[PDB]
Design a protein around this ligand. Sequence first.
Ligand SMILES: [Cl-]
Ligand SMILES: [Cl-]
Lengths: 464, 464
Amino acid sequence: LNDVIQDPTRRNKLINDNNLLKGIIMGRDGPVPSSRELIVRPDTLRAIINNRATIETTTMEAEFTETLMESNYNSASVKVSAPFITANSEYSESSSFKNTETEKSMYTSSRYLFPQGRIDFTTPDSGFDVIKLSPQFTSGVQAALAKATGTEKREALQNLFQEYGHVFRTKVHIGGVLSAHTMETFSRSENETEVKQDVKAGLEGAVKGWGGGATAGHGNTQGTITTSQNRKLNVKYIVNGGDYTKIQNTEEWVASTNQSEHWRVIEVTEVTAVADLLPQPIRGQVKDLLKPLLGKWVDVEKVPGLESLPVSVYRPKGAIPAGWFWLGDTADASKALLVKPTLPARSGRNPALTSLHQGSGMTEQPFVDLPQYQYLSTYFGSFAHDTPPGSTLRGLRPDHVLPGRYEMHGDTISTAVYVTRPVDVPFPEDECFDLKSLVRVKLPGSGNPPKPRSALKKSMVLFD
Amino acid sequence: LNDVIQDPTRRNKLINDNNLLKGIIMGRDGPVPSSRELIVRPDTLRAIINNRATIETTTMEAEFTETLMESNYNSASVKVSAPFITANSEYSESSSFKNTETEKSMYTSSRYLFPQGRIDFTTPDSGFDVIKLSPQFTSGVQAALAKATGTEKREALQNLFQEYGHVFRTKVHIGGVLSAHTMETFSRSENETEVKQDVKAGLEGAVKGWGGGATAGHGNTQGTITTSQNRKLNVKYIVNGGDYTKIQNTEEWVASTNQSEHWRVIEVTEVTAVADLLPQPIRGQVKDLLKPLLGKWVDVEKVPGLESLPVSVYRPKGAIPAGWFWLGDTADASKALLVKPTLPARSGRNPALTSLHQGSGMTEQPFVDLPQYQYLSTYFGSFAHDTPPGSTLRGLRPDHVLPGRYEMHGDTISTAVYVTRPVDVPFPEDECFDLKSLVRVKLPGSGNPPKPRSALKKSMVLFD
Ligand SMILES: [Cl-]
Ligand SMILES: [Cl-]
């Protein structure tokens, strides 16, 4: 029983085995627990009893989240952890996750939970026993903010989060779990609702058949499933908790999930960013210093030889200050945003920006130098990385951008352009800049790069 | 002091004066407290001490939220309350809130908070003292679910929420507040970021000048402000808490906010839907019965005489069952969604669906019979409300839809169409159906209705 475990020193076994005192490092190797304790060891754990077995499913369209899906993070935990795994991922041109003009990808994870309960860590500035950060971490923050220069403070803070972790798990389900994980690539011509429901039912069916003893028993393995609509899927099967030596006989493994010794984290229900646990004044100072870009609003000038276009095309009217960069052609006649990276370049660290090169095809459009980086606008001219204004044009690390929305302008497809705006959902969780990024509807020639449809996140840019 | 008030019977004065035990009715007259108690009177209130005065701002693009903005609900509370005020609002063709092809509107509220603390009501199935629903409400739910037919159960549940409320305030700030509320209509050609920041700084400046004693003192009133960018705004000034008889001398009012007797709710920090407070089995039964539409997937047939179009146009292949309705022309060659309302028509109650009429202009497109209702597709032909398939075509109540996203198709503007898809944000709070709703890029003739860009919410449709 959950209440029984929380009473003596066996609650310390539950805390220690599950790394409940440690922040989670979001890196290229997936979610990794810190070797250092983030919080002070509590006298008691806040537990909600729930022994009801259920099948839960998570559908995820965000790239770089596969290791979080496989660690049974729910959508709310993936959301908070997503900028950190994205920023620290190993980018590749050969990824199977495809987001093209004709195709899209998604991850689907189903989990047959055999729980005992939920453990809650009360965050500071919330009603309740509350989280107390370890003095070792607090001293690290103080030592980081005490550095002579802005660059030194940011480098020490970066080192501090790489050691302590990016997020802390504030709500976790404890018990045993049998989970199935998949990825699917489908045509944009398909009904998204039909594809999602078909993959979810097929995955739920596989975990349902595995759990409760109906299919041939197995442990951690790879398998293939066929949905009702004939989609063939590569499935990864994962076991967490219970006695793994008993996994061959499903019902014997299920019974072993009632043993306090074999209880493990079975779902990450809620996660909090480590910087958000910091007290009120320091919190804002740390968060400002963590922003990868500096921002500046500057004057614009109209691009000549664009009389054919339905709208006026703009670029910063510089005199672009040394070390500053621009992000693409705009329909904003008033101002342009310039950006400057706050962190020095280091081997193993993904920079906030990437330079661009003209494509080897018949095209004159830029291509990102660093794989999987994104840019905001089509280039209205002939790009060259060695000549202005292309020499100071930059692409962005994928954690910096979210999908935008097009507003089409033009009386002919050949002259037609899209003006990128932030999505107009009434209750956004994240806010983006309205930069009025210009995208060509029909680009001339072949070998042209995928058309951008992105908006820059406001949380990534520090002003003044 | 907050801790001092919570100890004797003066905590009951704080609970009673602020209606902390009552659900909030979201109707045409704004947020109205229920006359009936939703929860059992607690022995103690969970309080977080915070006497730090701050200026907070909320920007809201959602229509029908003005009375929530004026009641100092933050964006998270507006979000949860929004479907309920939208569904119960008094619709009008003469609203100043404009969302056209060339213009958009938004609400901005700034509040100069003079707090004492925050009161938290712990929801059932959450760590902590927890909420216990009143036996009068619980008996009402049981009596509603005991009705002979589906229609009778739904009517009794509707009556139950109109009496008890749609939402419950789970986190509230207590003290005194000076707030300014405005609305702004601007051209889509404008930078949204610049407009939002300009209105927020102008509104923050007005509350800053009012509070702390710098401008001429006043109480609840209407005024005009001018932003840094020469935008002229109609401002509504509201006072909550403190001694209102002392409002003329700002500093005397500020000092009166430290008196336990004058503490009022100053911000609605978190709100929970009343149905979400219900225990696990009943919760799902109530939520299914509250859905305004029944759903059914049916076969489609291609619309003839559409050879010129870049895509195939579809309508349900009916034999449309009696009492069922369709929602517009689609590019979905496999299936079509049919809808049926679950509640009977009643005077004063906004129906889930509206019939349509052909516009009096040169147009052949349908127009909603009920003001402010929305539809999903342009009609690919000549609409008539008295002939099939137009006789069974229906528009939707604004709470049923969210903005969608266009995917353009066509080699000529005149033949070009948009296929509506759900927004592709990676972490949506709300999910919509992908219906592949077809919208004409360039409609022939004048007097044509505003082009739709909407997706139907999945939470509004009950299947099987
Ligand atoms: Cl290339
Ligand atoms: Cl009309």
